[PDB]
């Protein structure tokens, strides 16, 4: 089927993120017909370097911070009654779900 | 009176400032972070940044 919805997941804790996928595809393979498999996008890597000292003097050393971002996406063929049901399934940790209504 | 704030700042390094320390030298303009360098390194972890390499 009726609507063609799409769900997206961005987060950092991979284990939390790979978990909720397993949870949602379980309920989808539970009560549905045919959905998708997780399309794994390449990670992003934010990278910053600084001088490790506040002042200027010293020996010339550096530091390199970063953070990775992990991203996934899936779609379903069904009426939107289902998405209002299964977007409530205990998605506690830092995990951004972003979901479209029909193909967008 | 009218000549108080007459200077058209609008650009440069005497326009921006570290949001927290209210400083002007050594800023970071990447991802709207707009933060003094020492100040960034200080916190740098609630933000989620860490270092592995």
């Amino acid at each position: 089927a009726i609507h063609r919805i799409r769900i997206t997941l961005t987060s950092r804790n991979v284990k939390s993120l790979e978990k909720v996928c397993a949870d949602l595809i379980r309920g989808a393979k539970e009560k549905n017909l045919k959905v998708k498999g997780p399309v794994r996008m390449p990670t992003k890597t934010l990278r910053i370097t600084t001088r490790k000292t506040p002042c200027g003097e010293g020996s010339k050393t550096w530091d390199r911070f970063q953070m990775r971002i992990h991203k996934r996406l899936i779609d379903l063929h069904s009426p939107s009654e289902i998405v209002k049901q299964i977007t409530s399934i205990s998605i506690e940790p830092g995990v951004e779900v972003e979901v479209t209504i029909a193909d967008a | 009176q009218q000549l108080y704030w007459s200077h058209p700042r609008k650009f440069g390094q005497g326009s921006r400032s570290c949001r927290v320390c209210s400083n002007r030298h050594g800023l970071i303009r990447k991802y709207g972070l707009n933060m003094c360098r020492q100040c960034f390194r200080q916190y740098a972890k609630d933000i989620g940044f860490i270092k592995l390499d």
Binding site: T10 | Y31, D46, I47
Partner: peptide, 19 residues
């Protein structure tokens, strides 16, 4: 968001919030 900002700039400001 409303301004349709990148996911990069999003997570960052989400941290600046908590600080």
């Amino acid at each position: 968001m409303a301004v349709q900002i990148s996911k990069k700039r999003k997570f960052v400001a989400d941290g600046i919030f908590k600080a």
